[PDB]
Write an enzyme that holds these catalytic residues in place. Sequence first.
Site, mmCIF file in Angstrom:
data_model
loop_
_atom_site.group_PDB
_atom_site.id
_atom_site.type_symbol
_atom_site.label_atom_id
_atom_site.label_comp_id
_atom_site.label_asym_id
_atom_site.label_seq_id
_atom_site.Cartn_x
_atom_site.Cartn_y
_atom_site.Cartn_z
ATOM 1 N N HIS B 36 38.472 42.911 37.333
ATOM 2 C CA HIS B 36 38.851 44.389 37.830
ATOM 3 C C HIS B 36 40.378 44.218 37.661
ATOM 4 C CE1 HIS B 36 39.151 42.083 41.759
ATOM 5 N NE2 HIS B 36 40.276 42.527 41.680
ATOM 6 N N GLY B 137 46.287 41.369 46.503
ATOM 7 C CA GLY B 137 46.997 40.589 45.462
ATOM 8 C C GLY B 137 46.339 39.061 45.598
ATOM 9 N N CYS B 139 43.369 38.238 45.160
ATOM 10 C CA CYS B 139 42.335 38.195 44.092
ATOM 11 C C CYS B 139 42.848 37.257 42.929
ATOM 12 C CB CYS B 139 42.028 39.564 43.528
ATOM 13 S SG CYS B 139 41.155 40.658 44.632
#
EC number: 3.4.19.12
Lengths: 293, 293
Positions: B36, B137, B139
């Site tokens: 993503h 962030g 991720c």
Amino acid sequence: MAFPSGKVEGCMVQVTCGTTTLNGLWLDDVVYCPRHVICTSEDMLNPNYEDLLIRKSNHNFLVQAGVQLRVIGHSMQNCVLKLKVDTANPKTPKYKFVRIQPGQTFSVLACYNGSPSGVYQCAMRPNFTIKGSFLNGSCGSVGFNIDYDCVSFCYMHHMELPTGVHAGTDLEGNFYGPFVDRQTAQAAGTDTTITVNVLAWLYAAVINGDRWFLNFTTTLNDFNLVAMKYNYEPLTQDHVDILGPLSAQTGIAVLDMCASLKELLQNGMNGRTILGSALLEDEFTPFDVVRQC
Amino acid sequence: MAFPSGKVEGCMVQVTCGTTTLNGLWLDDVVYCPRHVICTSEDMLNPNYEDLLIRKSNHNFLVQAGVQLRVIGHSMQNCVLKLKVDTANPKTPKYKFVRIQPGQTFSVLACYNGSPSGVYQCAMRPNFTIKGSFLNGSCGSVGFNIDYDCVSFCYMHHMELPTGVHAGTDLEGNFYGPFVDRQTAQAAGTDTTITVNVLAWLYAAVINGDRWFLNFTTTLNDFNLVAMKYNYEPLTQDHVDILGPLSAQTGIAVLDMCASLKELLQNGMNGRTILGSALLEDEFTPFDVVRQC
Ligand SMILES: *C(=O)[C@H](C[C@@H]1CCNC1=O)NC(=O)[C@H](CC(C)C)NC(=O)OC[C@@H]1C[C@H]1c1cccc(Cl)c1
Ligand SMILES: *C(=O)[C@H](C[C@@H]1CCNC1=O)NC(=O)[C@H](CC(C)C)NC(=O)OC[C@@H]1C[C@H]1c1cccc(Cl)c1
């Protein structure tokens, strides 16, 4: 949450004297470690470190890094022992030695036989102890912070106390608190709860959707009158100003959070849980919560 | 206590696509990261990752390690995205990708903008979520274990759920649990308490001088009859055999510890604290407590 430990992992070495083996911190061309490594089973009860170290030579110290470093100079600074070695650690980070104040936190890299085994976060209790998890051989493990790319070493582990808490020195060899490196019963002062840390914790809760504990108000002198009864450190104005940024980010006046806390200390949590904890946590500093906003 | 993170620190890189920036895992000549990253604000509601990645090229991916790596090949494996890069990571440790089972624990290296910020220990909840501490962030941060000198990567963070818990994938891109990488409300099953972990915790307590909770007895079928009421995972015989070594080291028959636990679940702790906690902790596995004996 604890600091990343990679920078400190590359500095841990195995130090041996006689049969005793503990951990050392290899920075530049020096290996720091607790001085009671030069002790035997009998010496530990009441050692005369002067006379004991006098009977030791450089070749009696076997430093093993991953390699077997050679010692070429040794001295004793307070309760720490400094080995000058021929090689300088290539993994030496940017570092400094700092003596932290009570209430401040730091990360501990727990090591055994010179190998890192785990990392966790601790606080310097008001009575200058720390509630750690240390086993035999853990001596020499260090506590540290990381500001920018600079490792601030602040702690070296030495012993456990009759109550199970832990005591140690800064990296100059001076014990935190009223402790001496001999195997005798030693008491620590009555502990106190770090009030400003509990407030920062309640802030971190509000930031994370936990708001069932918000309420009234109170004056600084009033809350402190309540806090002194529950062995809570008195909240000064400096503490208020330290929690300023958290107040701005959340929009809760510091003293209103204090009033909510006074409600908890008096009427208890009533089973509910704040941040998934059934007790009021006091090992998170405002600067810590800001680093995890 | 969490694993030392040095080996994993040397593998974290910053990945950028459009304005979105998250973390990636640079192993050998491949950078793994959540897919993503190729999403915009509008795409996140219901993206068609096929059509979206089709509109992307290698030069649209800006990997920045500490240096700016060049991409020369990209594919999509399940919900993870794999960048082939020209350089191979010199800090690549010995690693393997493993899919862990519910109840097992692991250490998370929380990163932002490709830089390590902290490390902590988590558990794979029975409902395949994790109670973590992730911000925007974060991720791309990974969960891992360290067996011998081999880093077993088992988790990559993707999203937060309406209840505040967290969800992610293994390092092959397959989500743990019933989750999909789109910005929609998704529910997790009713959670359960990892019973065998709570027992290992009570053992760790006994090892550490906490014994006020020891008592009676019960049969495996009896305790499980009590446990099923408190949303506690049923204790099988495999669980007993897993706790064997802790029983041998402490001398408490497993089922006698179970009886003590049943007493806690029924009559509660009554304010007392085990290991300095007012709740029954279930994120410590028997293997974990053995590593900290
Ligand atoms: C070094 O690894 C080791 C770490 C200790 C071992 C047990 N848990 C730890 O953290 N430190 C020592 O062995 C240290 C060496 C001395 C020279 C200080 N001694 C120590 O930690 O033992 C302290 C025991 C508790 C004290 C005690 C003394 C008298 C009465 C009672 Cl009840 C307790
Ligand atoms: C990446 O860093 C980020 C981490 C998140 C940010 C907030 N805390 C985290 O852990 N992950 C995302 O932004 C992720 C991307 C999607 C493609 C999956 N989306 C996300 O985490 O937002 C999820 C919000 C909770 C869900 C929600 C949806 C509908 C209703 C409700 Cl109440 C909640």
